[PDB]
């Protein structure tokens, strides 16, 4: 008998432990949650149109301009201009943006190395199978 | 071997998928990442000493007082002396802190119901076996 609060508490303890295997980033920590989330979207799936960021952020066009403006202020992303209409052609990572995303990538490489040292090949099969099955199931509709 | 970015990308896509299953909240989206982390720690596991939050935030006393001062000015938490002790103080949730956590817990339960509706008993057995095995392996040494 295991309520939603109990799963939350377990997930958060786990995250707490990933925090213990995962270093610091000082700009990741200053970012609001939707800024980090949009930053990672562009860093991961490449340059994006405002329209794609607006769709992705399950969010509005207004709140996207705030999020991109704030990421631009921080030096992390830039708008490339369409010279025909003076509107945004894409959001892309800046140099500083790419570097920071390397800190995050690198910290996470070293989290995995630690997790993996705690897994037997058998643990790895079981955990792996359940992760693939969840991704499979959530991709269906 | 495993590349760090490959698994990250697939992890983020999953979260993305969960984003669309999890009702939004105007306070959470405006909080910084470590503010939210400290807020949930107290909301999930009760009132904490500043020491407790530092040790947890794998972080400093200074940076804890800022995260807490910030949570305090959004009206979510307050530092309170112990009635009995009289000489220890802890960060506790305000009334509004509890109302926001209630929304958050409610949204999580909703996402959980949505996820669970996409699993057969067979999908569930594999997924939760994997979950259990990961929690046990990460809790070992
Ligand atoms: Cl799993």
CATH superfamily heading of chain A: Winged helix-like DNA-binding domain superfamily/Winged helix DNA-binding domain
Structural class call of chain A reads mainly alpha
Tally of distinct domains of chain A = 1
The number of distinct helices of chain A, counting runs of at least 4 residues, comes to: 6
Total E-strand runs of chain A: 2
Classified by CATH, the class of chain A is Mainly Alpha
Taken as a percent bin, the fraction of beta residues of chain A is: 5-15%
Largest sheet of chain A: 2 strands, antiparallel
Greatest interface by residues involved: A-B, 54 and 49 residues
CATH topology of chain A: Arc Repressor Mutant, subunit A
- Indicate the overall shape of chain A: globular
Rg of chain A over CA atoms, rounded to whole Å, is 19 Å
Give the termini separation of chain A: 28 Å
Q: What proportion of the residues of chain A is helical, as a percent range?
A: 55-70%
Ligands, deduplicated: chloride ion
In CATH, the architecture of chain A is Orthogonal Bundle
- The SSE string of chain A, one letter per element, is HHHHEEHH
Oligomer: homodimer
**Strands side by side in the biggest sheet of chain A:** 1-2
Pfam family, one (chains A, B): MarR_2
Protein name (chains A, B): Transcriptional regulator, putative, Mar family
Domain HTH marR-type (chains A, B): 4-136
Keywords (chains A, B): DNA-binding, Transcription, Transcription regulation
In short:
The first copy, chain A, has one domain: Arc Repressor Mutant, subunit A, CATH 1.10.10. Helices cover 66% and strands 9% of the residues of chain A. Chain A is built from six helices and two strands, in the order ααααββαα.
């Amino acid at each position: 008998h295991m309520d939603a609060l109990e799963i939350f508490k377990t997930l958060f303890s786990l995250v707490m432990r990933f925090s213990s295997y995962l270093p610091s980033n000082e700009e990741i920590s200053d970012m609001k949650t939707t800024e980090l989330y949009a930053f990672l979207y562009v860093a991961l799936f490449g340059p994006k149109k405002m329209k794609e960021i607006a769709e992705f952020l399950s969010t509005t066009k207004s709140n996207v301009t705030n999020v991109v403006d704030s990421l631009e202020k921080r030096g992390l992303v830039v708008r490339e201009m369409d010279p025909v209409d003076r509107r945004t052609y894409r959001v892309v990572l800046t140099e500083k943006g790419k570097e920071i995303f390397g800190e995050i990538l690198s910290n996470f490489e070293s989290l995995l190395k630690s997790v993996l040292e705690k897994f037997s090949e058998e643990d790895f099969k079981v955990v792996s199978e359940g992760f693939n099955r969840m991704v499979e199931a959530l991709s269906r509709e």
